[PDB]
Subunit: 323 residues, 4 copies
């Protein structure tokens, strides 16, 4: 999994969802008056509207990622073997990971508001049902000003400021940030010959400033490549050019089918990529077998409704036959 | 630039066209009776029909890459500082690099036929009575059985069998193949802990078998990454799943705008990606700011015409607004 | 700096001391009745004898590394920006870093004993003198059974089991161990072609299993290279062969003069390398300009003395002129 | 195998000899009137004196490397699968690879003189005996002005100017030089943060400018590391400081025993390292288990003799017991 933020006049938030198999992912808009019931904290009968992509092997919006109508986004990413969820703890806001995106996005308009809410959070090991046990996750949250990372591990709950607006999978975020220090010399420009002033070395290709950038599909390597690609990206400050660049950033760390054999005949691959415009409440996505970008605009729905609005994803290639 | 072949059930051929600017690329179908005139070899008044992307700035089809109606494809890729074109030589077939795609694809139905035609080729330093735009190039050719690489350098003309169906930019192809030896251990599966049997090392991420794969945008790194990605790709044999995988393979080595700063506020980036179905005569492409796949089928045109059939490329983002 | 352990029938402990300036280093044997006075904990009037290399100032043994007569070793290595020393704390054993090697090695015969002593250590920010402020350091300790690492940072005092018997400089030891996970595939044997079963890749050199091993002189890269080299070393279980292999392991991560420019035309380089036999109480060393190994055997001295026994180091190249 | 040149005030030439076993290497001085008999070219009854290390399995001086009394040096390095020796060719100087060092060093005082002699060379496939078939080799030659590389492959005989004064094993020398282009950015100084101006990246270690330098024991990685370590080396002009730096350079690419398992409980490892002073006719060496430098000075022998002067190598550890 890879989640990023990117700004090009509007603030975009989105992710590659990387997994072995596709479980009826759908675009779900949760309107303001869809009541959220929580297992161990108070209910939210009226809250901010949310749009995201959800699993939807249930009626409840089981989001993988989403944004709300105020421009706060949140994404859960795989954190296998590092995630640690806790016993109910008296005096904390005991929230299950499956409730966590609704809990935050329902009531917070900004990352700063989320940080205050996270001060008393305890992420509890309460399954949605015995049918649907918890995934091991960590989270990226982002608004139009900043992003943070939330990690609940055996050591406890940590909330990090994210200076690069990227998250992937394991290990913990402090390690991910640290490892970037090893890549300081990488450049978008022609590297100087520091190797020796006594010999001529030839620039036989463009792009040589990036040599050392890792290209494998592992978590830490994707973190470095996404970060370098994100921070050095350029694009016009127009919607279509901006989201194009965003999906190019996510493409740079997508996982092609066949390359990550997880055993059986199974491969981890990038099932979908999303790009959310935080200002405009638009969720864009592409899927592995549909390269055309599809847009769902939360503001075209009636956000005072009580009922989930669910759209299927376009998963087959939409080709322009030009003749 | 990156060109590849990939077989599912059909045989596909195509490329990333990487450059600093998009300037009037078009899809040009050259019908059978559009006369090809050549400066130093005999004319081809009647020939195989061809479909490709060309530089729209000439009245003649100046192809970057193309396929013919018999399933033979050819692509010219940048080879700056390596390409060497020659004086007219008595007894050779003297063909300019700008004539070379029409020369081959006009009259050859297979790669084996092209090898025979290439036996007395001399690639000559001509554009008639002026000095030289002539781009420094080398070529990938491919049919439904095989691919080869054609390089004219200061050492002479070499035609290589291509065991991996990939080409990029500099250096020479024997070096590109040789360099693959350094990557033999890379795997799609979980790597064994060979480092030491005395310590426990954790598989904290999927994809770790690929560690060592280079992820910078230089020519040799893109050759390695495209090759590893192509050879380990998997897809269903359906047209749509096949071309999807094809464009994924090309995406793995695309150049995102901003990452290769060539000076003057310019960047080398992937202006378009093509995928051609050799069996069906269909040219598919995506452009940097249009993620939707566009298809142009040569067999829908009148191939007995005398005149070029030219389609502009769709270069603005084609979004499916689903609500 | 790099410190290691290595076993080849005897248990060896030692280090490269890497720095831009020598502080007049000597071999110092501290006998059993040289009284150790401590600033904030009880004195050790009678203790285990110790041999090591110390900064040559003739009033207290300021050890860089040392071993005692019971086979326990300890080394201080640079930890700049990471080391944090503390205020005096009531209820702790408040020991200055300059006292720390005498404190441990004076009274502990094993690493397990040192772990018990460290349980209530607080490493306090008390200078030897105003003329010689504390260095930022961390420590490796090793006996004939195991090794540990001791790190006092802004988060607190941590004592790690060291499963590889290696330490270098920054960052913290948990990151150093974790990073080894990225190197699991590295092998001393011929790597298999996992890259693709469809092409032939040639083993054109020996040693190709190690591709990926980093060769720069930075802390993390030396940690990885030293660890791989140490764990995969072989040697006869005879003294001369064993210590030869030891010095080969240290040579693999030594810093050549000219390669680490630290600014004022000063260079960080490996001033000396040591190898101590824990069973025999022998301190062997080589120096940057003296490749011959020199041996100082603590057991040849009178260990009941009151006074430091100091040997100057052999620093000039000792050549065998054979004709 | 690795051979280098290095200049301080004197010009030095030497090599690591890397192989699976040590069997009777000796230092052999060939005096001026030891007759060299050649299989297919004229004899050299009187020639320059030569000192080097040879295989001590024949009466004939089978040199691995050597220098002559005029300051020309030559080394044969393993080139397995690349070396190609030829049939006897009329009108060439047909010289066997076992004769080649004597042939050159016997009659040439400079590299320019060797280039002239090599114009008509044909390296022929004539074994020393059927018991001892030819090794696949290539050669480095060096005088007090320059060095060159000699490679006889299936493509023919090539003589390259060597701008870096380094050679290892496979592949061909043009590739080795080319590959150095990939390392241009490596520096002995602190690298700038070019990765992104928007984030702070910490220089947590010295020596970070070398990151990317390969540290495995394979031929191409050793070439790069040796070249970087040689060109950026510094030392005082004294003989002893000069040869120490030289042996430090060679140490940086030595092969530790255990790390290159070639099967059968055998390892490729650095059996000896040499350093020759070209001006003074002194052959210095160290062996895997003898870290002390040993020196054999050709000018202390009677160079008018007829007979080989042979010194066994010191191969057991020479320790200075200071106590």
């Amino acid at each position: 999994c890879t989640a990023i933020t990117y700004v090009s006049k509007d603030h975009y938030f989105g992710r590659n969802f990387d997994y072995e198999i596709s479980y009826n992912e759908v675009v779900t808009i949760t309107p303001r008056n869809y009541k959220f019931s929580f297992r161990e904290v108070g209910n939210l009968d009226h809250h901010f509207a949310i749009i995201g992509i959800a699993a939807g092997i249930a009626d409840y919006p089981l989001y993988y990622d989403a944004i709300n109508e105020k421009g706060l986004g949140m994404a859960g990413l795989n954190f296998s073997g590092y995630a640690d969820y806790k016993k109910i703890e008296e005096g904390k806001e005991n929230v299950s990971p499956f409730e966590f995106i609704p809990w935050v996005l329902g009531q917070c308009s900004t990352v700063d508001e989320a940080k205050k809410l996270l001060k008393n959070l305890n992420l509890v090991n309460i399954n949605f049902s015995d049918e649907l046990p918890l995934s091991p996750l960590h989270w990226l949250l982002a608004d139009k000003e900043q992003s943070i990372v939330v990690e609940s591990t055996k050591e406890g709950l940590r909330v990090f400021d994210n200076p690069v607006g990227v998250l992937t999978n394991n290990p913990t975020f402090d390690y991910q940030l640290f490892n970037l220090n090893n890549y300081r010399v990488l450049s978008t420009r022609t590297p100087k010959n520091n190797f020796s002033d006594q010999i001529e070395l030839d620039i036989y290709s463009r792009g040589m400033g990036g040599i050392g950038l890792p290209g494998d599909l592992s978590s830490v390597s994707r973190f470095v490549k996404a970060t370098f690609t994100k921070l050095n990206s350029v694009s016009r400050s127009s919607e279509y050019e901006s989201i194009s660049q965003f999906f190019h950033i996510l493409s740079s760390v997508e996982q092609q089918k066949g390359l990550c054999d997880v055993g059986d005949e199974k491969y981890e691959y990038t099932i979908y990529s999303s790009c959310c415009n935080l200002e405009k409440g638009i969720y864009y996505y592409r899927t592995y077998d549909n390269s055309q970008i599809t847009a769902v605009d939360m503001n075209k729905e009636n956000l005072e409704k009580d009922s989930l609005i669910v759209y299927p994803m376009v998963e087959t290639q939409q080709i322009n036959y030009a003749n």
